[model samples]
Target: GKLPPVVHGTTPFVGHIIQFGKDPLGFMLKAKKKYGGIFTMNICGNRITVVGDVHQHSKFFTPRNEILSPREVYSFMVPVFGEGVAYAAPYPRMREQLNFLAEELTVAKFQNFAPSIQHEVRKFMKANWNKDEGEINILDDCSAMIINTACQCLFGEDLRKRLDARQFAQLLAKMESCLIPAAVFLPWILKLPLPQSYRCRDARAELQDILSEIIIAREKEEAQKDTNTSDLLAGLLGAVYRDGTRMSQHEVCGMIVAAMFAGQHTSTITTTWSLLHLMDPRNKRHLAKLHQEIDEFPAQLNYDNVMEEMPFAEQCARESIRRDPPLVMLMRKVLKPVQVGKYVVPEGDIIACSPLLSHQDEEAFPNPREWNPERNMKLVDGAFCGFGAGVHKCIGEKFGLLQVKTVLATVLRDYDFELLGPLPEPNYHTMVVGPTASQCRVKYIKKK
Candidate 1:
């Protein structure tokens, strides 16, 4: 069987990594153009095969664990999420953990969480977005608000009491720098005694320590069974495996941190970008459509079905994510020789798929880069991968959309904002993408 075309970008060993490092989306687009969807590139000496077309990206989500290994693909996550959780855990354990996680993500659970989310949104925005601030950092504003809302909704008020919202949000942002491509491709760099390493180590340790303390407190509180709780941490405590065994207090702590980070980080960055796309100079009218949808909601945002009233707002969220997804690349480490588009993909090759590639593909998405939420109402299975797909699809997909929608609805209804500078580029150095904190500044005013 013929192998996928290896991109010849005038470098040996390093191959297209320099270009990939600088502008990964652009590099993937160029690779797709040159090699026609299925192609191979060396990312920091590791050979990776990228599937550029969502239609032909089926094998990327192949269920045969004997063929592809999701854990191996996410080695970078280990340091950030801590050990004994997420991809670092055994496959069965991870699956059981995910099953446990699914408890809080239920429609019933979200229905309960809606009011809490709406309240947090109302409280935070009123205090922070006041005219006294003058110029607000959109990225900073969104991150703080979203992280606080997530803390309240996922861990309950205890966490919000323990950790200052702004500080925790800033810590998470700083922690993201440690997961940049260099850290993944060059894991040894994190071990070096350097300033960056120190920041990464400290941020990871502080977050883990804080979450550990909170988990211990929550564990003792839950055993009493007196409190009514809908938070994810409570849900995880109740998660039982197939053997009917419950997650340990220790394991539960690790899982809670993972869930919090996964839910908070992606949604925070995405909320930031979604707002940017809505207010982009070339796309300010899109914001009006979103505002119209919010106005149609009939009341302050809250509840399970609140999204149903804001179709255009929901579409804008989907489209904005499609255009500027939080995670640009989805990777699967191939464990066995597999076929992808007439080429044999060998074991040990990392299968890389970019959301930007599929979302911006001209064939699948006509006028790919344009922000037209009108076209997002009916996207097929592979049509959009803003939150990934198949067994590994984000468990919090609906939760995230709800969170983003709530934020947009609350803001659009009560306030108006204007971009204060030229549109900003995504800082792809981190795993989740977003504009620079200061660069995403905007002027906000109450919609009196």
Candidate 2:
């Protein structure tokens, strides 16, 4: 049996590979124009079915009963993210970690880590800036700053090496390079002519080594030292293992990598976008009002009051995300034959719903192209899903948002900033969408 054609194209492997690197969102949008909403993109001999219908995406959740799982198909991501440890395990073990993430990565963790975040921000600003005015790259600066903040507060010293300035940057580059379709693809276990694959291997090994060292060192300190440190690593270590014991070093390291993977980078992209969006002089007044709120803090950003104090700030950011989501597409693989409003998709087919693309629907959003921070305040459904839908809805949504707000509030409190380049066009990469700048230009002048 043959599959239905969604959109057909030429078969040069080079062209196929270059299309994504050249312009990912543009490629998808071009497909939308040709195929009328939903279509399939055939790349590297893999058929990725795209679904733009937000309503239809709700039905794409992972079902309760299944044998040959929908997730195994994503075993491809193992090389990219180091999920091999958990993905290879039984469902029970996977569920244990997932369940905890849903429960523990909450508003309360934000509360606990608030001061630590502010402290890191102050340190970051001081270290990175000295003169009253200068230009910097938001892409690199945000990446480094957010990674440091997330490591210090959301985690501890061990996994913090995952953000070890030089190492982490190289790791991110190598991981992304390897995964960029054909940029530098590699084989498993053995290293070959594949360029970035060896870097990928080394990065993964370094991560494992760091986590292993951190866990052992911490466990030893925790057994005797009395500092009352209660970071996430502590909590994870405290988690009871099978046989009613603690998790093994490898298991702990795997979880650290997974958690770290889920953290840092996405929020950096979002924050970078937020900073760029606000840098518009038309929007600068609005930024000033928000910065005024941030400046109200007593000589320092009181992260202790972040969620409480940054209401309008959060609203402004939420609106930005709703308009231009950091993640362009949400994907789900169908495990069983399921009927979706006149279209019954069979098992083995994957659907990619475009949350960011759906934001373009003017009918769902009046003047959809306009930048309106207040547009999201209205009660709306089905028009947007940047974070996603159903049981596997992104767990770190709140924490991610909190990180964005905290960074914004902390920085705007002191610095009058402008994004270096034009607002970054959507990156559309092997993975997450992020701004292209390393730092937003800033002047630390007293409020007028």
Candidate 3:
């Protein structure tokens, strides 16, 4: 019926950009206390209406794309994922494209992922953390492991030979570095002639060239013999749209880039944070429980073991995400006026639902700051959106969780970890949030 209350701010053009940039969660929470559940704030001449109330989350996630479009808000991802891919594609086409990738990650395709992930994790520990007792940057190591394991699980052997994880990580880094976070509020920034723009374009082109080579090689192999490849690339190449047309090479490559771009940071951050929390001295009992849950499994893990058997380990990963979601906000541009609780979000407003804010709701999570993996926690619907909710829920959720859980199972079995310092505070400045890289050092003692 009425417009949402606006947060008080002094700056005219800049609005609340400075405060939101520094500590978004704190800024939103402070505003929530004064303005209640649904409120608006001006950021860089845009009116962003935040749906902070857990009960009204359905108003945010349940709307059709026609009413609340995500393409404009997520246009920043176009350079990394490439033009005519993902949010850059038309709505129906994008849905089909996403469905194709989701099909590749289904339970049927994950049969061998556990062992692939476990083997990579073990190989990493043996090579780098080889010393009986040593110190290393846990964030960096975890990120490397996630990239390596994901490649092993998703890319075929022939493809891996052409483009190894190290090389792939470099390309992804170049593209990821080009993203400007401010583009979310000021879309015009993306139109600027920035050097990182060239870097991102070049990196994507390089990846496309490699994929073309791999596909040519695979075609020759298929011609010579009846080859059945079960990799993600193979699955994607075989997909057909409802129109009965197969995906083009460009679409397939875009899908692969999107998959890695989406999973790499979020999964790595989750694995890193889970380890940091469990290994903290203050949470010794929680660490002990994690060890107990993981001890029953054999040195080589299986899909069932990580997916079904390891509840506590899964909980540890979940709680870590609950505390500090890698993606702080899920947003959309209001295409049509929509009612959110007592307020009517008008067309052209940027509406957002923050996982970081919702995860810390006092009633939903008691002592919201405390890292308690063992607490018997139950959330109201949409309370825990680490993987998101409703129509656009992350298709990579199951695989990402499995990857983190498998890594933890393998790592915990062979080593004992001690936090080198107080757990690192989250670095929110990054496009995909993670613990401060410089502060994520940890001491590892090989289990005797």
Candidate 4:
């Protein structure tokens, strides 16, 4: 076994962190060209081995957690996901907890999601875009719709009465803003007593208290009548772990936070990007196809309509994610010597595979810069990891896509959007990447 070639760097200790920070895709792409597919780069003294080639993607994703663990690389999420939750929990318990969250998001739970999402989207449009024609920032507006729809679909009416979507969003922002993406390399940063950390702590406590009140109310309601509400909260509350114990209020709240946290920005960015691309004058043919697809649907969409009938709408969302994946990198810590092609990555190294880089592979996706929804992703076996692959693939993929596609179908049918300017360049500086918010302005002409 051999060590992966290390990218040559000029600075001591800092290594290639500055260049990688400036433009992650460009720096990694350039490094791949010089050092081949599997190369190690020193970022703030941490050895990050990137699996850059599409052909060897299985090498990156197929390893079990025992061989290559995700816990260490994702410890930065503990503050947002909460203590003893997700990556912060012990591996076995973490798996069980994630499994519980996944069960709540399965297709079986999605029967009412389409209409709920459509309702939320229509409500948002009527409230925010009531004028015949008006200007709005797509990213900002889409983010609002995403959170609103998610709460509408996942929370019961009683719970929503206690905690509105806007309030929940504010709390989420306070917690999410505390994240330092650079903590992936320098975990000590999270240890520092930062004001944002206090803000996050306070936000989490408030959310927990709100959840506690909701739970108490739910129990009282359940005790009074045979109230069978099939929401995410109800589903999670009913879940029994392998140890035969129900989740505590704290764990339940953490899972709820995680569910929203994972889907909120990613789904919002995807919806915004899809709208941006479809509304652009240059992609009229693609837009025409999208219109044709949605025009056939009835006024009110059902799960089957959005989940089964809107293939092209799904493609639009998928293509947007392919072009600009919100979560750019999936990383793991090497727990043992893991063979990646001819190289054996040693223990204590950070192993990463980037969706941003893989989606642009010339062989997998030709003319990678262009936004073509018609492009076939079958050229490579594992080229499209927009939702990731293998063991740790995103559990919320179906739910997220359903939410986005339903919103797209509803909006595209009602409004004619004119891009006020050229599509915005992606802002990679944020933890979850998206089009620069200020540049995402558009003019909406409501249908009579």
> Estimated TM-score per prediction?
0.90, 0.83, 0.98, 0.98
Candidate 1 residue pairs that clash: none
Q: What TM-score would candidate 2 get against the native? A: 0.83
| Residue 184 lDDT, candidate 2, scale 0-100 | 20
lDDT of each: 0.74, 0.63, 0.89, 0.89
For candidate 1, the TM-score is 0.90
**Per-residue lDDT for 231-282 in model 3, tens only?**
9898898999899998888889999999998999999999999999988888
Whole-model alpha-carbon lDDT for candidate 2: 0.63
Where model 4 places Cα greater than 4 Å from the true spot, the runs are none
- Could you tell me which 10 consecutive residues in candidate 4 have the lowest summed lDDT? 221-230
Clashes of 2: 9
Note the clash tally of each candidate. 0, 9, 0, 0
Tens digits of per-residue lDDT for model 2, 1-448? 2233456664755334467558766676677777655566655554566665544555554344251243554454455545434554566666666655555577766655666667777788888865666666756677777877777776555555555644655655665555542312222322346666666767777766776777677768777787765666666766774557666656666666566666667788777767777777668667767767776676545545677778877877777777667767665556666655345556666656677777776556677656677675334466667666666678888888778888888776767666544555665553666654433443243233
Pairs that clash in candidate 3: none
- What does candidate 1's lDDT look like per residue over 192-261, in tens digits? 7667545756787786677678877866876877847556666777788888898876567667666667
RMSD, candidate 2, Å: 4.0
Better of 1 and 3 by TM-score: 3
